[PDB]
Design a protein around this ligand. Structure first.
Ligand SMILES: CC(=O)N[C@@H]1[C@@H](O)[C@H](O[C@@H]2O[C@H](CO)[C@@H](O[C@@H]3O[C@H](CO[C@H]4O[C@H](CO)[C@@H](O)[C@H](O)[C@@H]4O)[C@@H](O)[C@H](O[C@H]4O[C@H](CO)[C@@H](O)[C@H](O)[C@@H]4O)[C@@H]3O)[C@H](O)[C@H]2NC(C)=O)[C@@H](CO)O[C@H]1O
Ligand SMILES: *[C@@H]1O[C@H](CO)[C@@H](O[C@@H]2O[C@H](CO)[C@@H](O[C@@H]3O[C@H](CO[C@H]4O[C@H](CO)[C@@H](O)[C@H](O)[C@@H]4O)[C@@H](O)[C@H](O[C@H]4O[C@H](CO)[C@@H](O)[C@H](O)[C@@H]4O)[C@@H]3O)[C@H](O)[C@H]2NC(C)=O)[C@H](O)[C@H]1NC(C)=O
Ligand SMILES: *[C@@H]1O[C@H](CO)[C@@H](O[C@@H]2O[C@H](CO)[C@@H](O[C@@H]3O[C@H](CO)[C@@H](O)[C@H](O)[C@@H]3O)[C@H](O)[C@H]2NC(C)=O)[C@H](O)[C@H]1NC(C)=O
Ligand SMILES: CC(=O)N[C@@H]1[C@@H](O)[C@H](O[C@@H]2O[C@H](CO)[C@@H](O)[C@H](O)[C@H]2NC(C)=O)[C@@H](CO)O[C@H]1O
Ligand SMILES: CC(=O)N[C@@H]1[C@@H](O)[C@H](O[C@@H]2O[C@H](CO)[C@@H](O)[C@H](O)[C@H]2NC(C)=O)[C@@H](CO)O[C@H]1O
Ligand SMILES: CC(=O)N[C@@H]1[C@@H](O)[C@H](O[C@@H]2O[C@H](CO)[C@@H](O)[C@H](O)[C@H]2NC(C)=O)[C@@H](CO)O[C@H]1O
Ligand SMILES: *[C@@H]1O[C@H](CO)[C@@H](O[C@@H]2O[C@H](CO)[C@@H](O)[C@H](O)[C@H]2NC(C)=O)[C@H](O)[C@H]1NC(C)=O
Ligand SMILES: *[C@@H]1O[C@H](CO)[C@@H](O[C@@H]2O[C@H](CO)[C@@H](O)[C@H](O)[C@H]2NC(C)=O)[C@H](O)[C@H]1NC(C)=O
Ligand SMILES: *[C@@H]1O[C@H](CO)[C@@H](O[C@@H]2O[C@H](CO)[C@@H](O)[C@H](O)[C@H]2NC(C)=O)[C@H](O)[C@H]1NC(C)=O
Ligand code: NAG
Ligand code: NAG
Ligand code: NAG
Ligand code: NAG
Ligand code: NAG
Ligand code: NAG
Ligand code: NAG
Ligand code: NAG
Ligand code: NAG
Ligand code: NAG
Ligand code: NAG
Ligand code: NAG
Ligand code: NAG
Ligand code: NAG
Ligand code: NAG
Ligand code: NAG
Ligand code: NAG
Lengths: 122, 123, 112, 430, 128, 122, 430
């Protein structure tokens, strides 16, 4: 049921997040190729995990941040986004802001950790 | 650094009881063990016994097994050795030795000895 | 029990020259946790002993490079690369076991 | 009440690949992973486990690696298929027959030139074709022959096997363990002791000794199809020699292509042989019998007879020493009936140069001549015996797989997979 | 005292209530010249995959970063009807692992769903 | 820049930690070297993540612990350490104590988790 | 007070495996990962670092990998061991001897057929055996000879070396840096500049120039066992040629295998040679001398003498132009004494086809012929000099390690391991 949510709207689809996550880790000729495949799968997994770490969302499938939506990335109503769009359509809709949002998530987490250190030192 | 502080030297007549003590300072560590040893003049050391102050659990040396006891006192960073009575044969230099132990390592990183305190027996 | 003897128990040393002390046990000093527990101490006259070597060969903090430990089983030794007048005193091979804990006889080092 | 724990001390039997390790050219430059100068051995308090030396994959891995390394070692060496020609052959120079004096027309560095060359050969490597007489090298009809590089040693330098991360090896401390079932006293190690990758047939020449008593182990005993591996509690001293001062010459057969030929013999021509202390040997057989009787009856008569027929690898005791391959007639060691209630044994040995090292077809190795005189000294630590199968139980020495020479050291070890994640009920809830 | 460290597997023969103190000892040891070295690369890769599968599950269940975590999932009794006074005090982890091996997948499935519900509820609260 | 903070003092450098962290993991013969390099980068990455996990600092670039400084490691004033030293100098300054500090961190985290279980069991 | 910090910008000296990169059939036929079209460099303010170009193992990898690449490129190519035949050979025809007309009995696609083949050879690759006269190819007693496939070019296209994740390369910006100590001005790069994998002996003809002044570097200077590497701040142009219009023909030697050989000479016969600007060369040495004096004395006389005797590989300046192998007599460049207070120099060059590229024994490469006339232009970027070791300091050109031609570019780079995890005291506690 790994891609069972593929045609679902975002508000329906984000319930199977676990189902997909749990399936991501799963001689000469036919010798080296399989080792290469395992290594690359590992790197993909780790890059996603590192980013969740960087943004403060490690250990979660769903996490809220304190970054506002800036409207200009998408001016669609949230009721349009969550109920009348699928994740694939959505990802395409805002694909060019991926790096902006990620940079903001990163900076926010740095500010939050800095403030916590100041408070624990107080 | 880690240091042990020992109590004053004292002299007793045989048949009299005695309390000797050590205090720990200069560091802040979790688990550590305290042991007592004795140095007889002209001799090396005799083990007297050891305690883990966290649990208050002591094995003792077979020697003095029923003659001397020790306390615990983790809460005040101290250690005690108590004789029920002293005998002429007990005149010696007494030491506390502290072993700083990491529960996840199996190693004693600190092995500290106090300078040695005399307990003597006279008349 | 671990009964520990040392040899020689009297070791005058030509100043500035190397020397070593033997340490011999009644039984193995290997613990069930797989480590060997044996330590060396230096007791200068008028002083408490200082630990020099931890776990047979681990030179401890602030310990001169002059002190080298080695051994296995029941056969242990302390080697001094050069002996200084500073090294005069009694060396002990301490025994960490499954109880009773014990200390060896002790070897006196002097200069001659 | 579910609580999840990680770092749980549990494991499952598992088959994994172990790696070799070495303590400071075959074997000698196989640095593998450098070993731990002072390895840790952890006793497992209260822990018992079952072992089975007859089903031990570690044995299979030694076979896999040992065979692979020997094949790899010949990869860059000069082929001797150019020598597969007819030879004219006569005797050598002796009064009154193992050696032959044979000659042939060999290639040189140029394709337009030929040379007359000759060398000494052992009978076992040469076969008559013209039923002087005409001969061919005995393996040229069926296999490639490759010369071992003369600079490469095969000395069985001990190596250690170690588990990879996620795995550990359990080891027996049970002095009486018979190879299978529960082992009451165990410890865990990352690495095994060093084991010499020795190859032999009838005798086990350089292994470990039993701690107290001669140990006799078999997959079955009752089933006569199985071998019996006997581990001595004391070594038997054996001294072998190839008492002939031989010389060697190189022949250029092509562009940087050299063949190493036996030149001549200085002095007398004598048979290769092995000397086994007679007194020790008799004592060890008596010990073996006392222990064998535990499976046959206290007053059962035990007899030691010689080997059955077949190839030298199964009828004789073979070994590699000095680079030469010896085939010793051990029948001189098994001539005794043991009934309830200084000197030496000299065994003649044959010498061969073209060796089917792993008893395979198509891959023959040629052992280049060894100059000088060979002396070999070893500790016989055990035997490979079979039952000759009603008041007398007869045993015979014999050969077997090379795997049986390795399980003899590996019976004390098992490898398991560590499985640190698990759950249990407690009294807590988030 | 007794210099008790025990070692890597350590007291594998001790009971669960004694054994689950050395969890870190094991965790710290799980990660630890020409050709044909592929055998070792294969070994290294497989060790990594094993490590990651365990870590992912701890993540999915909400127990990441801990050696011991409480969950809010009930014990359903049929899995094991032993008392805690019997489980923690008279059984080793190896015996226990065998005792409930047939429920591994049951417990794990329940753990995943509980965490799914917990994250859903947290988002509803943060959206409030 | 990835090592741009290399000459900065510790009090200045420990703001760019994400810059360094995010760049740590980033047909024939010799392809084995390439694979080996990828595997080794992963192993290094995982060892660091494991320790942060073990010490209770998972998901953070900066974490305060409950372990005290024991002075003998360094008797410098915090203001000397943070304002007049770089991290490279500092790393050398307390090199030899690495195993002591880590042993203490590991012990502390175990005690903290044990206490959390006792409270959740109450 | 203990706070753990992760992502700390610190490092340790380290050695790892580097990979190549290239900015998009030749040389790196497997090529490399594409380079960054706009690579970054991070100036490191208030950072110093210590470099040692003589212990820089980035050089060792460059060496090792070039050898590996070289050998792989010959793997599928035609073997010339079938040419190890007796040659009937005489002078090609000229007036009052570099080229000889040798004929031989060659194989064909069928084993039952033979052909008479003749071709031209350089005298340096042919040895007389019957001391037409009988000759053989000079290496047919010692080594296998492999024809380089003519389809593969080895032009030394520059590549960049790049560090793997977890590593970084530090680079010097110090224009006066000599490579044996602290470098006050550094920056961080992931990849090096492009470096040409060029092979040469006495002169370096296509590397980098010094930014300001001629640099002279040596591990020691005082110790005469060390080499002196001289880097120019200006290029010196050299025009080289093999001024002989030649043809090529192929011979089938077996199925699928062709041998390439010089057919004929369709012009005059002339010696190969190189023309270096005379004025530039004189000025160039004067600059070298001015800098050499810093280590020898302002009034010390400096002399340039030619190379010592020995094989062409160590006495001449060799290079690869168009795939042809030249061995030039540089004596004309080093024949003067420098005492304090348009034209060209023509150097004759020998041509060889059998090349022991890595100075190994048993592995020789045969350079196939090139048709037409060869013209090649290069830039002296540096020299390899030695001290000939009471007021005169004499230097000679000479050979050196192949590694020495590369450390001259890599002296500015160091590999370091990134160590992101560490601790410091803070005022915060959980
Ligand atoms: C020390 C050192 O290495 N210094 C280098 C110099 O070597 C380098 O000099 C250049 O070297 C290359 C390779 O040797 C030369 O390129 C060859 O040129 C000939 C002639 O081609 C002419 O006609 C072409 C027609 O379109 C023109 O495009 C080209 O520019 C010329 O005008 C080619 O024939 C060579 O090979 C090609 O043809 C053959 C035919 O069979 C093919 O097999 C090959 O695969 C290939 O297709 C090379 O192309 C180049 O001219 C040299 N330069 C000079 C000035 O001589 C120098 C860079 O110039 O850099 C130094 O550092
Ligand atoms: C059971 O275990 C025993 C004990 O380990 C093994 O016996 C040893 O086997 C090795 C290998 O065969 C023997 O080593 C050999 O010794 C020869 C003689 O050495 C003496 O004379 C030389 C003369 O120059 C001196 O240099 C040397 O110091 C000694 O004085 C050597 O000649 C052998 O070869 C060496 O030199 C050649 C020269 O080109 C090199 O190529 C070789 O690599 C090597 O360097 C070799 O050293 C050893 O002596 C044996 N010991 C005994 C007691 O005999 C058994 O073989 C083993 N059994 C089995 C079945 O494995
Ligand atoms: C059989 O073995 C012998 C050596 O053991 C092989 O070599 C032959 O040895 C004899 C005696 O040394 C040689 O004869 C001598 O030749 C010299 C030459 O000047 C002569 O002066 C002596 O008077 C004597 O004749 C003989 O030539 C030598 N043969 C060769 C080919 O070297 C013999 O070849 C071996 N035969 C075979 C078939 O292998
Ligand atoms: C989600 C998003 O905006 N993605 C970007 C693409 O839309 C963009 O495509 C370009 O959009 C322009 C808007 O008027 C078009 O005029 C232009 O033709 C179109 N380009 C193509 C190739 O379709 C691309 C490229 O600019 O960038 C994405 O990030
Ligand atoms: C099995 C065998 O014969 N080994 C040879 C030894 O016998 C031989 O004799 C040894 O001589 C020593 C000289 O005093 C004796 O002490 C020693 O006991 C004796 N060994 C035995 C087994 O009796 C040695 C040569 O010294 O060579 C062995 O190969
Ligand atoms: C609390 C709990 O989950 N208990 C489990 C029981 O419910 C379960 O048996 C139940 O039997 C019914 C019979 O028709 C099934 O329909 C029902 O699905 C099944 N419940 C579940 C959760 O599978 C027993 C079965 O061994 O296990 C208990 O743990
Ligand atoms: C192995 O089993 C023995 C017997 O159950 C355990 O010994 C008990 O250990 C506890 C501490 O855990 C002591 O309080 C008891 O007094 C011991 N009883 C006896 C009779 O020895 C032992 O601890 C277990 N684990 C080991 C030894 O590794
Ligand atoms: C085995 O043969 C070799 C020769 O192959 C003998 O070597 C001799 O050693 C002595 C030592 O001084 C030399 O003077 C001789 O000249 C050597 N012989 C030759 C032919 O050079 C060696 O001694 C012989 N060994 C035995 C055991 O007989
Ligand atoms: C091992 O040696 C024995 C002893 O020489 C060989 O067998 C002998 O063969 C002769 C031939 O007639 C008999 O007379 C002897 O009685 C035989 N002796 C024995 C004990 O059978 C035996 O064949 C040799 N075996 C091998 C494998 O070489
Ligand atoms: C060593 C050898 O076999 N040489 C013979 C040679 O004597 C004979 O004359 C020739 C054919 O006549 O064939 C060669 O093989
Ligand atoms: C170590 C050992 O003695 N193993 C078995 C034993 O468990 C078994 O019961 C017996 C026959 O039943 O055969 C022994 O070999
Ligand atoms: C192509 C060639 O060289 N062929 C010669 C042939 O002309 C000569 O007559 C014969 C011996 O006489 O040897 C052959 O190799
Ligand atoms: C390298 C070389 O051959 N140099 C020669 C030299 O030996 C000779 O003596 C001189 C004239 O006699 O001409 C030089 O070119
Ligand atoms: C597909 O579209 C229909 C239209 O009503 C909708 O009901 C159904 O749930 C959709 N399926 C998915 C996967 O969203
Ligand atoms: C060796 O001598 C014997 C004596 O009869 C003879 O039969 C045998 O054939 C000879 N060997 C050879 C190779 O001629
Ligand atoms: C056994 O001893 C007898 C005694 O004469 C002997 O003849 C026989 O050959 C011996 N057998 C073996 C195998 O040595
Ligand atoms: C045989 O075992 C003894 C036991 O110490 C050993 O000293 C001797 O060298 C061994 N012999 C061989 C050849 O290994
Ligand atoms: C280098 O030192 C100067 C001195 O004021 C400082 O301003 C500058 O920021 C420093 N650079 C770094 C990387 O800290
Ligand atoms: C750390 O150990 C090394 C060992 O050589 C020693 O040189 C160094 O001084 C020690 N640390 C300090 C701060 O001295
Ligand atoms: C070939 O050149 C050599 C060079 O010395 C000369 O001696 C020889 O006579 C020449 N041969 C012919 C046929 O001209
Ligand atoms: C090949 O012939 C040359 C001629 O001088 C000689 O130097 C070289 O050593 C010979 N090679 C062999 C393998 O003998
Ligand atoms: C450059 O050479 C001088 C000569 O004494 C030496 O002191 C200096 O350290 C060298 N510097 C480098 C970076 O090699
Ligand atoms: C090489 O030939 C070119 C052709 O124009 C000429 O300009 C250049 O100066 C020549 N170089 C030398 C060193 O003669
Ligand atoms: C070699 O000699 C033959 C003899 O006919 C002649 O035809 C040929 O042209 C000569 N080779 C060359 C390249 O001149
Ligand atoms: C060589 O001669 C041929 C004859 O046609 C001519 O085409 C070619 O261009 C000449 N090559 C040179 C470089 O002159
Ligand atoms: C020599 O160096 C100059 C420097 O700009 C360069 O332009 C020229 O192409 C170089 N020539 C060669 C042959 O490398």
């Amino acid at each position: 049921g790994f891609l069972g949510a593929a045609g679902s709207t975002m508000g329906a689809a984000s319930m199977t997040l676990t189902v997909q996550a749990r399936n991501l880790l799963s001689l000469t000729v036919w010798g080296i190729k399989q080792l290469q495949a395992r290594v690359l799968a590992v790197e993909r997994y780790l890059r996603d995990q590192q980013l969740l770490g960087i943004w403060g969302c490690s250990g979660k499938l769903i996490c809220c941040t304190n970054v506002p939506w800036n409207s200009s990335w998408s001016n669609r109503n949230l009721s349009e986004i969550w109920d009348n769009m699928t994740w694939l359509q959505w990802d395409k809709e805002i694909s060019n802001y991926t790096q902006i949002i990620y940079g903001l998530l990163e900076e926010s987490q740095n500010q939050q950790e800095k403030n916590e250190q100041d408070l624990l030192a107080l | 650094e880690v240091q042990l502080v020992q109590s004053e030297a004292e002299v007793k007549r045989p048949g009299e009881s005695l309390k000797i003590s050590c205090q720990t300072s200069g560091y802040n560590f979790p688990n550590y063990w305290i042991t007592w040893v004795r140095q007889m003049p002209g001799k090396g050391l005799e083990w007297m016994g050891t305690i883990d102050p966290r649990d208050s659990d002591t094995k003792y040396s077979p020697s003095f097994q029923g003659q001397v006891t020790i306390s615990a006192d983790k809460s005040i960073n101290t250690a005690y050795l108590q004789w029920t009575s002293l005998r002429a044969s007990d005149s010696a230099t007494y030491y506390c030795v502290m072993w700083v132990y990491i529960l996840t390592t199996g190693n004693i990183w600190v092995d500290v000895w106090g300078p040695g305190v005399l307990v003597t027996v006279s008349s | 029990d671990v009964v520990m003897t040392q040899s020689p128990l009297s070791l005058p040393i030509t100043p500035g020259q190397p020397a070593s002390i033997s340490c011999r046990s009644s039984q193995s000093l290997v613990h069930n946790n797989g480590n060997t527990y044996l330590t060396w101490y230096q007791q200068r006259p008028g002083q408490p002993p200082r630990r020099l070597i931890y776990q047979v060969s681990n030179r401890d903090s602030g310990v001169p490079d002059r002190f080298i430990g080695s051994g296995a089983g029941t056969d242990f030794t302390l080697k001094i690369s050069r002996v200084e007048s500073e090294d005069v005193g009694i060396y002990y091979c301490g025994q960490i076991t499954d109880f009773p804990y014990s200390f060896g006889q002790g070897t006196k080092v002097d200069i001659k | 009440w579910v609580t999840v724990y990680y770092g749980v001390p549990v494991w499952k039997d598992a088959e994994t690949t172990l790696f070799c390790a070495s303590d400071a050219n075959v074997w000698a430059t196989h640095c593998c992973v450098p070993t731990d100068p002072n390895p840790q051995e952890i006793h497992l308090e209260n822990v018992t486990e079952e072992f089975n030396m007859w089903k031990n994959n570690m044995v299979e891995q030694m076979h896999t690696d040992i065979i692979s390394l020997w094949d790899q070692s010949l990869k860059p060496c000069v082929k001797l298929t150019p020598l597969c020609v007819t030879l004219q052959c006569t005797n050598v120079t002796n009064n009154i027959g193992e050696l032959k004096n044979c000659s042939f027309n060999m290639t040189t560095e140029l394709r337009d030139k030929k040379q007359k060359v000759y060398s000494l050969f052992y009978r076992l490597d040469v076969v008559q074709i013209n039923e002087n007489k005409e001969y061919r090298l005995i393996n040229c009809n069926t296999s490639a022959i490759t010369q071992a590089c003369p600079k490469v040693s095969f000395e069985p330098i001990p190596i250690h096997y170690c588990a990879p991360a996620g795995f550990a090896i359990l080891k027996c401390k049970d002095k009486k363990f018979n190879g299978t079932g529960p082992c009451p006293s165990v410890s865990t190690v990352q690495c095994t002791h060093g084991i010499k990758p020795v190859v032999s047939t009838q005798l086990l020449l350089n292994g470990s000794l039993a701690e107290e008593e001669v140990m006799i182990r078999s997959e079955n005993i009752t089933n006569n199809a199985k071998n019996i591996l006997v581990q001595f509690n004391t070594p038997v001293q054996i001294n072998c020699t190839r008492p002939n001062n031989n010389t060697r010459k190189s022949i250029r057969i092509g562009p940087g292509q050299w063949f190493y030929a036996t030149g001549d013999i200085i002095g007398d021509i004598r048979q290769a042989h092995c000397n086994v202390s007679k007194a020790t040997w008799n004592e060890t057989l008596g010990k073996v019998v006392k222990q064998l009787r535990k499976h046959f009856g206290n007053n059962t008569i035990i007899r030691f007879a010689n080997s059955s027929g077949g190839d030298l690898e199964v009828t004789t005791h073979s070994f590699n020493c000095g680079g030469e391959f010896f085939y010793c007639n051990t029948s001189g060691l098994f001539n005794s009936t043991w009934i309830s209630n200084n000197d030496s044994i000299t065994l003649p040995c044959r010498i061969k140069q073209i060796i089917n090292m792993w008893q395979r077809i198509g891959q023959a190795m040629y052992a280049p001549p060894i100059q000088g005189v060979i002396r070999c000294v070893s500790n016989i630590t055990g035997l490979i015996l079979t039952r000759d199968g009603s008041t007398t139980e007869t045993f015979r020495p014999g050969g077997g797989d090379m795997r049986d020479n390795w399980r003899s050291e590996l019976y004390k070890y098992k490898v398991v997979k560590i499985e640190p994640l698990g759950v249990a009920p407690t009294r807590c809830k988030r």
